[PDB]
Enzyme design. Structure first.
Site, PDB file in Angstrom:
ATOM      1  N   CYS A 112      90.888   3.216  23.489  1.00  0.00           N
ATOM      2  CA  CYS A 112      89.752   2.299  23.607  1.00  0.00           C
ATOM      3  C   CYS A 112      90.192   0.956  24.163  1.00  0.00           C
ATOM      4  CB  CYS A 112      89.047   2.075  22.269  1.00  0.00           C
ATOM      5  SG  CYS A 112      87.657   0.855  22.425  1.00  0.00           S
ATOM      6  N   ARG A 115      88.749  -2.938  22.228  1.00  0.00           N
ATOM      7  CA  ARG A 115      89.029  -3.101  20.799  1.00  0.00           C
ATOM      8  C   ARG A 115      89.082  -4.550  20.338  1.00  0.00           C
ATOM      9  NH1 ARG A 115      94.201   0.151  19.879  1.00  0.00           N
ATOM     10  NH2 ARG A 115      94.321   0.104  22.192  1.00  0.00           N
ATOM     11  N   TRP A 284      78.897  -1.255  23.618  1.00  0.00           N
ATOM     12  CA  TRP A 284      78.226  -1.494  24.893  1.00  0.00           C
ATOM     13  C   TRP A 284      79.093  -0.946  26.017  1.00  0.00           C
ATOM     14  CZ3 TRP A 284      79.278  -5.502  21.466  1.00  0.00           C
ATOM     15  CH2 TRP A 284      80.486  -6.183  21.694  1.00  0.00           C
ATOM     16  N   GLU A 289      82.256   3.187  33.413  1.00  0.00           N
ATOM     17  CA  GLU A 289      81.933   4.466  32.788  1.00  0.00           C
ATOM     18  C   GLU A 289      80.694   5.085  33.421  1.00  0.00           C
ATOM     19  OE1 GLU A 289      82.397   4.520  28.327  1.00  0.00           O
ATOM     20  OE2 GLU A 289      82.228   2.334  28.612  1.00  0.00           O
TER      21      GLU A 289
END
Ligand code: HEM
Ligand code: HEM
Ligand SMILES: Cc1cc(N)nc(COc2cc(CCN3CCC(F)(F)CC3)cc(F)c2F)c1
Ligand SMILES: Cc1cc(N)nc(COc2cc(CCN3CCC(F)(F)CC3)cc(F)c2F)c1
Ligand SMILES: C[C@H](O)[C@H](O)[C@H]1CNc2nc(N)[nH]c(=O)c2N1
Ligand SMILES: C[C@H](O)[C@H](O)[C@H]1CNc2nc(N)[nH]c(=O)c2N1
Ligand SMILES: [Zn+2]
Lengths: 414, 414
Positions: A112, A115, A284, A289
């Site tokens: 991730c 973070r 969000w 992506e």
């Protein structure tokens, strides 16, 4: 006491956190598997013997976290959980321990990039839920809260933990909000090719498909091991962004849109050796992506074709980089479109700067930060972002998020 | 018997080659270092005891390669090398073994995306060289041959192997052809910031710098452990491509150019336990090495600034992706410019397709192909190229190319 370097700023950080690491990676001294997608160490039955070490290890870091390590309150809770694991061969987390556990599973998620926000997570305790309808209600409140009028907020909803294994709570959707995918007569795919099997499963249990492009799928909620049931999210809760470009007035004619809330629902939350098989979490979107992967993966929406056409590009030759040129415009448009609607989004440049900043804080006030380079670097413009140049150590810390098999390959049906 | 998947075509390959692997990676069962740049297992004194296993292991695969494994010719050569390692505590490769060894060091280079050409490598035996002048002559013939009028050809030149360690042949240039780098009064950098220390070393030994941008550096050749000497490559042998764009007539005013021949000179060739500390090898450029990294790395030429200016881009906001948009144009221009001069170049799309094709052949006729995902994926447009979606197993096979310390930190001077 290993060292990691940034080969853009010559900055060095020292990692001692990896010594606390427990789980395994898949790599050996003689092979590296850092590019296997779902290694057998990332995927998820436990017994009573193994539970107390896991519980003690979790309690010791939770109480060391509120600056009361080993005090009376720790020692009695250690004993209290011991007792309950004798009795029930399992145990229950306090509300405070569930929040801590949940927040550090995110903190420890090495793949991730977002973070930096790990401590600002909103934890919804749904461990008193008993029915698929109850789950649907908990999930709707999650969507409403996390969406917050486009001012998105991080949240997670935690349904009851695994017990025997056959009384498992599962969301069958891989994400709370996804677009449907339908194969065609000619074999081609309408909607999202990723979900074509899930879209079939929904229609198998009785969905009525509005067979189009961006059809929001219904939820399939399995409660306490029971056969899962269909529920449609109220459309007023599903916030969507129409995609336009700040130059090209034919971009509206392209007719694309996307949902605001990324909310991953198919994974497992592990806290002190307890397994939460249903724990949808949301934040969000980073722009890439949608604009890079969702829109331009060959086996996804695959729009590089038409975007380059409307730009009138040299498409005969591979080396005209028409693919690259249409990819940057698509991501300028997704970003712009979300921002002009006050819907929270972050560009791959801002998000990767924050993660380096976040890495700084983690090595200083924690002694490290597990990071998966293969996943942190964004899927476009890799090396003009600072993460490309940052060495990262990947290791597995708990509490953690883990992959789990899809329920329709496990569920003893009826 | 591990498995690797492509998550774009659902193609699966099976790797048994990794069982033959010998060297170590840096990863353990509890940590992955797949994103450390120069791990201690990639960097390079050996003794007589360790030499024969290495030599036997190399001979056994060379003779198994010409379809005469274990025959008389193998068994006598095994014995012949044994004898010579008793005598000299080292040994010499046959010409045929040097070619095989050199070609498979490339074949095994897991960070190289161009390996589809590994068998078409031209091996120049310079093991009879005794002087820095001799090296300069061998290197000039290498440049001429490999350049071939812009019709570039793969080649390597191999100087005498390490013996004691203090009689070492080294090229001090990291590449045969590089542009100079000079710091300024205000601290800024003219030319190439990467080479500023090397550019100083050349001037320390007596270079006369034409203190500009794209000044081709002289060679610094160390022969048999002696202090290295300066030699200037005849300019007629250094082929250069002026960079223009097929749309923007202000791109010429940008005034950039680049050398045609990538020729890495600072690394070590390992063959049957013998160490070749000077082995410059060359092929042809993939476009992104120049247009993305060389031109746009922050600590390199860093031209995203001015290219976006001349495009008149929204440069106030990070999320306008002006950086991305100027990066695609720079790579369209490098490609176009090389191709309009009949100079060999390959785009990141064509080169990554070839490597997948090459991976196919390697898993079929060899049982695997070591690959470093972190290095194979190109530094722009990652996921619109097929390598992004291909799982790769990284492991270390020999013969191999290895990093080695820079000579000016090792050379007992005079
Ligand atoms: C707050 C904004 C967030 C952003 C911008 C963000 C961004 C990302 C991105 C880009 C990925 C790569 C996944 C992909 O490419 O498919 C990822 C993975 C992931 N994130 Fe975050 N995320 C956010 C919030 C969260 C939250 C709230 C959680 C959990 C509570 C979380 C946990 C994870 C996990 C577990 C993964 C996947 C690791 C794996 O595949 O094993 N993230 N995130
Ligand atoms: C024929 C055309 C070739 C192409 C297109 C090519 C391409 C590349 C690229 C893009 C890299 C990444 C390096 C970087 O980004 O700085 C690389 C690395 C490398 N290549 Fe190739 N190359 C070619 C020929 C060769 C040859 C002739 C050899 C050796 C005989 C070779 C061996 C290597 C090695 C050893 C590395 C670096 C591995 C490491 O860093 O440990 N390549 N190549
Ligand atoms: C909260 C959040 C915010 C954000 N901004 N983004 C995400 C996306 O996070 C994940 C994304 C995935 C995708 C899994 N992966 C997709 C590509 C593939 F299908 F090819 C292989 C499987 C798995 C996870 F666990 C994730 F947390 C999540
Ligand atoms: C023959 C050939 C063809 C081609 N087309 N390209 C190359 C470039 O190959 C290499 C490139 C490097 C660069 C090392 N690396 C540069 C970036 C950094 F400085 F940041 C860190 C060190 C090391 C090697 F051994 C290589 F073979 C070589
Ligand atoms: C083969 C490879 O592991 C796979 O394509 C990975 C690469 N890195 C990724 N990184 C992110 N963020 N998301 C992904 O889906 C992937 N896919
Ligand atoms: C930190 C990281 O290992 C480093 O920046 C690597 C990443 N991948 C790379 N890949 C290539 N081809 N060349 C590089 O210089 C790098 N640099
Ligand atoms: Zn590894």
């Amino acid at each position: 006491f290993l060292k990691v370097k940034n080969w853009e700023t010559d900055v060095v950080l020292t990692d001692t956190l990896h010594l606390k690491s427990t789980l395994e990676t898949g790599c050996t001294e003689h092979i590296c598997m850092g590019s296997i997608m779902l290694p057998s160490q990332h995927t998820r039955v436990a017994t009573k013997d193994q539970l107390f070490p896991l519980a003690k290890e979790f309690l010791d870091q939770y109480y060391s976290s509120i600056k009361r390590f080993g005090s009376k309150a720790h020692m009695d809770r250690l004993e209290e959980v011991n007792k309950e694991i004798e009795s029930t061969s399992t145990y229950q987390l306090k509300d405070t321990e569930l929040i801590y556990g949940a927040k550090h599973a995110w903190r420890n998620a090495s793949r991730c990039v977002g973070r930096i926000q790990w401590s600002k997570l909103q934890v919804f305790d749904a461990r008193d839920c008993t029915t698929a309808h109850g789950m649907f209600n908990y999930i709707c409140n999650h969507v409403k809260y996390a969406t917050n009028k486009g001012n998105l907020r991080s949240a997670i909803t935690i349904f009851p933990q695994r017990t025997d294994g056959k009384h498992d709570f599962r969301v069958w959707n891989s994400q709370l909000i996804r677009y449907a995918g339908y194969k065609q007569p000619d074999g081609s795919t309408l909607g999202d090719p990723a979900n074509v099997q899930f879209t079939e499963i929904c229609i198998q249990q009785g969905w009525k498909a509005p067979r189009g492009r961006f059809d929001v799928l219904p939820l399939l909620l399995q409660a306490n091991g029971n056969d899962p049931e269909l529920f449609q999210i109220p459309p007023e809760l599903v916030l969507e962004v129409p995609i336009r470009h700040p130059k090209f007035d034919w971009f509206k004619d392209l007719g694309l849109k996307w949902y605001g809330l990324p909310a991953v629902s198919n994974m497992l939350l592990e806290i002190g050796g307890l397994e939460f098989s249903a724990c949808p979490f949301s934040g969000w979107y980073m722009g890439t992506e949608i604009g890079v992967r969702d829109y331009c993966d060959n086996s996804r929406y695959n729009i590089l074709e038409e975007v380059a056409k409307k730009m009138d590009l040299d498409m005969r030759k591979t080396s005209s980089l028409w693919k690259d040129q249409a990819l940057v415009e698509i991501n300028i448009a997704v970003l712009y479109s979300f921002q002009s609607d006050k819907v929270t989004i972050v560009d791959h440049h801002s998000a990767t700067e924050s993660f380096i900043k976040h890495m700084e804080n983690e090595y200083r006030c924690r002694g490290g930060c597990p990071a998966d380079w293969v996943w942190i670097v964004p899927p476009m413009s890799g090396s003009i972002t600072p993460v490309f140049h940052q060495e990262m150590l990947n290791y597995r810390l708990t509490p953690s998020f883990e992959y789990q098999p899809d329920p329709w390959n496990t569920h003893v049906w009826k």
